[PDB]
Design a protein around this ligand. Structure first.
Ligand SMILES: *[C@@H]1O[C@H](CO)[C@@H](O[C@@H]2O[C@H](CO)[C@@H](O[C@@H]3O[C@H](CO)[C@@H](O)[C@H](O)[C@H]3NC(C)=O)[C@H](O)[C@H]2NC(C)=O)[C@H](O)[C@H]1NC(C)=O
Ligand SMILES: *[C@@H]1O[C@H](CO)[C@@H](O[C@@H]2O[C@H](CO)[C@@H](O)[C@H](O)[C@H]2NC(C)=O)[C@H](O)[C@H]1NC(C)=O
Ligand code: NAG
Ligand code: NAG
Ligand code: NAG
Ligand code: NAG
Lengths: 96, 144, 48
């Protein structure tokens, strides 16, 4: 909170807003906590199945098959962020 | 668990055969899904009232369903499954080449092919064989 | 050109095809096979 959105919280232990937006209106408000998402690590946008990935798992899918046209990040300071595009291969991951 | 402050209420998606339009012309993109639904989050069930006099067409070399890559049959969705994104829709296309063309060059992972007593004036979709007249059973899509 | 509205009848106890001793189906002859003598013919008989 400063004045802007109706959330009214200035602390940690609050939530987030992953929300889709069409040309005029808003839909699909889900409010995941800052718990289970401790620190912003990565953020993808994948072509097939049109799904978007705040680091790791799903947050939003829809019907279409539409390619990415733009992206962009605001932040004041911190680590120098990295943009990268990619193709689709096969891989396997060791995980304990 | 959903995000916060939720009472877990499953949504009810319904279907019904409507007063449909004409059967499709020559193009496989010229078949129109005369319903659309989608899954977003949480729980769902699918009220299929399409067992009423609609036979199931067993898959073979050209016609019928193309249920490989989706092992469940359409009347067993309502048991406990786990998907990642789901959208079903019905469409009144031809029968001999509905699924075998509409899976590869189409818009679904797999599709089923129910049938009924339909008029035999239906322009089928296939490369080079699009000048005949076939049956029109309703074919549902599912994008698993 | 006999896929036009002609259903295929799956074999069972009395009626239908008798494709055992010839594993290919009729719409898959045109792939690479090897025969020794071959003759096909159509005939309009009973079904059972
Ligand atoms: C489930 O939905 C189907 C899709 O609407 C219904 O099938 C429709 O039945 C109509 C009546 O037989 C057909 O209308 C006729 O179509 C022919 C062209 O093939 C025209 O020449 C006729 O004039 C026309 N009859 C009219 C206008 O009175 C529809 O074409 C046909 N739709 C198809 C085959 O896609 C099923 O009847 C319906 N089943 C139910 C309700 O049980
Ligand atoms: C997601 O949250 C926003 C909160 O801004 C909701 O926006 C409200 O929408 C209604 C109906 O359009 C308006 O009357 C309110 O004035 C909006 N609130 C504002 C501008 O603060 C939006 O509807 C939500 N999306 C849903 C519920 O699908
Ligand atoms: C990923 O996208 C490509 C785009 O051509 C598509 O062919 C492929 O089937 C997609 N993979 C899926 C849906 O798993
Ligand atoms: C995909 O689903 C949405 C959900 O309503 C629908 O509006 C859209 O027409 C669908 N796309 C098709 C059928 O190509
Ligand atoms: C329809 O959904 C409501 C909740 O949205 C539920 O209470 C009701 O039982 C459902 N109807 C069924 C399952 O027939
Ligand atoms: C499906 O909908 C019909 C009405 O269209 C209703 O009579 C029937 O009970 C429903 N089936 C369910 C909820 O399992």
């Amino acid at each position: 909170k400063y004045d802007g959105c109706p959330i009214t919280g200035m602390l940690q232990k609050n939530f987030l807003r992953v929300s889709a937006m069409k040309n005029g209106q808003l839909f699909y408000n889900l409010t995941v906590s800052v718990a289970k998402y401790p620190t912003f690590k990565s953020f993808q946008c994948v072509n097939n199945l049109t799904s978007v990935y705040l680091n790791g798992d799903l947050v939003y899918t829809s019907n279409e098959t539409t390619d990415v046209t733009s992206a962009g990040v605001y932040f004041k300071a911190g680590g120098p962020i990295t943009y990268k595009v990619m193709r689709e291969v096969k891989a396997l991951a060791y995980f304990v | 668990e959903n995000s916060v402050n939720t009472t877990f209420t499953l949504h009810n998606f319904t279907f019904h055969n409507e007063t449909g339009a004409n059967p499709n012309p020559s193009g496989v993109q010229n078949i129109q899904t005369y319903q659309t639904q989608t899954a977003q989050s949480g729980y769902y069930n699918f009220n299929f009232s399409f067992l009423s006099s609609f036979v199931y067409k067993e898959s073979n070399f050209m016609y019928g369903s193309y249920h490989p890559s989706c092992n469940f049959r359409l009347e067993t969705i309502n048991n406990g499954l786990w998907f990642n994104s789901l959208s079903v829709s019905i469409a009144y296309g031809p029968l001999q080449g509905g699924c075998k063309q509409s899976v590869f060059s189409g818009r679904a992972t797999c599709c089923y092919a129910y049938s009924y007593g339909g008029p035999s004036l239906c322009k089928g979709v296939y490369s080079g064989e699009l000048d005949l007249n076939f049956e029109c059973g309703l074919l549902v899509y599912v994008t698993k």
